[PDB]
Amino acid sequence: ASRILLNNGAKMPILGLGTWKSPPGQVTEAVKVAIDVGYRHIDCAHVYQNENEVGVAIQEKLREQVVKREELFIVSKLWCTYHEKGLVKGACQKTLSDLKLDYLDLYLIHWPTGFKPGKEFFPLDESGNVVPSDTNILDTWAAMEELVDEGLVKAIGISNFNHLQVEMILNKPGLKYKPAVNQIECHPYLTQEKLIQYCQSKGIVVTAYSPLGSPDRPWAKPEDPSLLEDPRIKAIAAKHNKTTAQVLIRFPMQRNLVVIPKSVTPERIAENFKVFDFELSSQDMTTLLSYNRNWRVCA
Ligand SMILES: NC(=O)c1ccc[n+]([C@@H]2O[C@H](COP(=O)([O-])OP(=O)(O)OC[C@H]3O[C@@H](n4cnc5c(N)ncnc54)[C@H](OP(=O)(O)O)[C@@H]3O)[C@@H](O)[C@H]2O)c1
Numbered sequence: 001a002s003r004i005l006l007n008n009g010a011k012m013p014i015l016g017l018g019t020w021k022s023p024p025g026q027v028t029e030a031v032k033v034a035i036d037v038g039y040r041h042i043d044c045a046h047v048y049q050n051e052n053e054v055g056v057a058i059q060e061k062l063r064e065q066v067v068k069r070e071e072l073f074i075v076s077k078l079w080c081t082y083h084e085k086g087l088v089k090g091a092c093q094k095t096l097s098d099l100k101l102d103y104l105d106l107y108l109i110h111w112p113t114g115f116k117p118g119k120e121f122f123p124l125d126e127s128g129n130v131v132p133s134d135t136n137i138l139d140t141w142a143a144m145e146e147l148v149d150e151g152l153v154k155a156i157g158i159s160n161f162n163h164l165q166v167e168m169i170l171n172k173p174g175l176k177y178k179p180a181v182n183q184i185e186c187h188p189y190l191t192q193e194k195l196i197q198y199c200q201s202k203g204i205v206v207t208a209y210s211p212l213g214s215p216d217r218p219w220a221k222p223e224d225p226s227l228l229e230d231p232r233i234k235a236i237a238a239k240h241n242k243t244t245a246q247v248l249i250r251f252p253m254q255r256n257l258v259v260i261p262k263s264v265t266p267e268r269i270a271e272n273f274k275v276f277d278f279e280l281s282s283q284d285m286t287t288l289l290s291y292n293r294n295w296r297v298c299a
């Protein structure tokens, strides 16, 4: 099965293309190649600063008759400076305009924390701390629900929400739509077993971000661990005649997760799609889960 049924009745492709850190001048080609090779799910965000160029690729592939819109599953996210109820719709409309789309398949609250609204993505103060906004996730959620009612988005969800934050949404007085997805960091060093089990028990699909460990993340240091170079994981890959990246993508798939590896390199975009022709064993899965160290790319 290449798609997972969401609680809104739509089917979400279990493999998607990530676009954080994909330069504007390279992401159009990346999305074009991804669609050609079979990807039908693109993970986007306003803060990635490249939605226009993602949209150019989508429009070109629609024009070429490679895909139709209903075959694509386009995800974007609401940035922290737009958590005020009155700003959510405008943020969504700006993303739709940049992507050249009439609707999104899924729109996520990018992080539970609201930041001061304004012209800074990351308003900071002298202590190095973010300037927050007078917002809370329940009022922001009500504004997200309105986007579903208006037909701008087919599903709404959350990202980087912990157990208690998910529970706060689910217990929200007046709740209209449950979150369809929680998108969280997940890989062998941060396996998220409890949060995943909780979300799945509530019918919330989990998407694993940074599944390769985000080796291109800013501020990576030589002392940091590296999933792609972990010899224990290389050994599992060699056993299956696959690459380490392919093992790391297949791992979340066998946990009934969606996974969104990022690449701008055509060969790697294609390699990362070749994960439907093999199975990790039960022991492979248990062994990968045993590597958890609660180590986060995104703190
Ligand atoms: N919701 C959130 O807060 C959040 C946070 C983080 C990420 N995300 C989403 O999740 C996506 C994936 O996470 P990520 O971008 O942090 O990192 P990632 O997908 O774990 O890793 C991307 C890095 O791996 C390299 N790579 C890709 N395929 C490879 C392969 N087959 N062999 C070797 N290297 C390979 C890429 O290189 P090249 O691109 O140069 O090929 C890039 O350096 C993001 O792009 C974004 O869409 C969301």
Ligand SMILES: *CC(=O)[C@]12C[C@](C(=O)OCC)(C1)C2
Pocket (backbone or CB within 6 Å): 020, 047, 048, 297, 298, 299
């Ligand atoms: C990893 C972490 O933390 C993070 C937040 C982010 C974004 O998105 O930014 C903007 C670009 C993910 C970084």
